[PDB]
Amino acid sequence: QVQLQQPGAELVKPGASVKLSCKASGYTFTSDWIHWVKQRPGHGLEWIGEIIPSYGRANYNEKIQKKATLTADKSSSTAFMQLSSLTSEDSAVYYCARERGDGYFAVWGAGTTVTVSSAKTTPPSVYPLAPGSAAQTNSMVTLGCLVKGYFPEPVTVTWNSGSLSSGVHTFPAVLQSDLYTLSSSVTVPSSSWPSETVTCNVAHPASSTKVDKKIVPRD
């Protein structure tokens, strides 16, 4: 089972605060430490601090400005990081990770994408990408989903609720006018579509939306 659960995203206004959660499962020991690690887009891993839930003590990276405050709840087995007075410097993916007191991070959470902005949350519009009638094909056909006008990052895109991962890639979002847009591409044997369904699933954590879009031949 997933050992550490973090929400997908948090949107925070400049100067506001947010509390990230990290819900743990699996074996738990008095020697466990929960660590938080920050990763800026396209940059490395930065250690933020640690807490020992069995005692409640927290230590922090002394090389960086202290934005975090760590607490934990033994009853709900959940660790919290309070980030305060955020600026755009604070936009990053924040991971939690568990260490058994022996120095290495055996397991990591999926990370919470925090975006610091004044802009408003916007769910995406999801449009199918099916070839026009003049398109020729070989043994394979290529389909797609256009995920447009969302904020903030991220979105997760899967094909056929996860069962289809070969022949899939999803492009990095481009941002414009305070909105992101991306597409995801899937390639299957031509013989197999449309007889066998192909559907894109588009999760947008910051708006709590999950949308399906079936891809059918153009009429």
């Binding site: 660590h35 690690v37 490395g44 891993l45 930065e46 250690w47 640690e50 230590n59 990276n61 002394e62 090389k63 991971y95 990770a97 022996d102 120095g103 290495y104 991070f105 055996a106 397991v107 990591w108 959470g109 999926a110 990370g111 519009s125 449009y127 199918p128 990408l129 099916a130 070839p131 026009g132 003049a134 398109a135 290529t142 797609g144 256009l146 447009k148 070969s166 890639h169 999803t170 492009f171 990095p172 979002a173 481009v174 414009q176 847009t181 991306l182 597409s183 591409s185 390639t187 153009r218």
Partner: protein
């Protein structure tokens, strides 16, 4: 605090070759170094602990070596799924610190792009918007250029491009080019063309459709 130097920042190797990543500590830390793999959009994953100790469920082609200040992560015969960023981390002295990471890249055979163009959806049109989407998929090397033509003449406004990182499935790259127009503008034209130029051929790979 312990500084961990990872150099070079990018390693390029040919499929099936052996590769070695370097991690150097600013002072001696015994064997208290651990290695992580992070693929594009994924979270880090422990590969090797205590410099050389294998982790359950990690392919046996991964191994680690070294002690003191100089540490090595090795992959015996690199394959596509190994494409990732690789980080070292020390636990010898407080606070734990991370190296700045090394990217693995694979030099595979040239491959020409598979080009696909897509007319705007009925659903998008209803909303007053029109986006024509072009995929240039699974090509190598990464350098590539894309050109839009509308009714035979070049179009440059409204075009937004996006490139993937190297693909952990086949070591290729892919790119999307998206021309966004209003419903009105889109309908004042007939022919939309996406043209791909890449070192695999002297002539563009061209894909078009007609609005009607």
């Amino acid at each position: 605090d312990i500084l961990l130097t990872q150099s070079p920042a990018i390693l390029s190797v040919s499929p099936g070759e052996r590769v070695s990543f370097s991690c150097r500590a600013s002072q001696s830390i015994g064997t208290d170094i651990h290695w992580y793999q992070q693929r594009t959009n994924g979270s880090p994953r422990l590969l090797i602990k205590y410099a050389s100790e294998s982790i359950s469920g990690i392919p046996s082609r991964f191994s680690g070596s070294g002690s003191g200040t100089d540490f090595t992560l090795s992959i015996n015969s690199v394959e596509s799924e190994d494409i990732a960023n690789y980080y070292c981390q020390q636990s010898n002295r407080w606070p734990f610190t991370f190296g700045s990471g090394t990217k693995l890249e694979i030099k595979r055979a040239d491959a020409a792009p598979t080009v696909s163009i897509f007319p705007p959806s009925s659903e998008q049109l209803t909303s007053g918007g029109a986006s024509v989407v072009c995929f240039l998929n699974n090509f190598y090397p990464k350098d590539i250029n894309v050109k839009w033509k509308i009714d035979g003449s070049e179009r440059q406004n409204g075009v937004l491009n996006s490139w993937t990182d190297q693909d952990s499935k086949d070591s290729t790259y892919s790119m999307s080019s998206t021309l966004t127009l209003t419903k009105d503008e889109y309908e004042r034209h007939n022919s939309y063309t996406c043209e791909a130029t890449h070192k695999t051929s002297t002539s563009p790979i061209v894909k078009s459709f007609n609005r009607n």
